[PDB]
Amino acid sequence: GPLGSMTRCPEQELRLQRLERLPELARVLRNVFVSERKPALTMEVVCARMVDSCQTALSPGEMEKHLVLLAELLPDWLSLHRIRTDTYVKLDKAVDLAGLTARLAHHVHAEGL
Secondary structure (H helix, E strand, O other): OOOOOOOOOOHHHHHHHHHHHHHHHHHHHHHHHHHHOOOOEEHHHHHHHHHHOOOOOOOHHHHHHHHHHHHHHOOOOEEEEEOOOOEEEEEOOOOOHHHHHHHOHHHHOOOOO
16 A cells, blocks of 8 residues: 555556556447457457547556556456467457446556546
């Protein structure tokens, strides 16, 4: 946790950024899959497409931490799969979006919707 008498800290954003990125990234992940037209996407594709296919261009430092955090909340919709030396990801584009942002909401509860 933070220091005593908490005020003007740059972590107050890092709590709500995760909360807006989790549901936003959930709708652009479906677009990133189909933009490349492939059943699995490498870290090289995802690092381009999650910036350009998404309406908002995210930085590559937070990108890695968000892609992995989906599979950490549910390994059932999104799975990180390591190949011989690269890493690919797999997601269901055919899912009902409103289901994911409803069940994953346990982490959005950090700020409370």
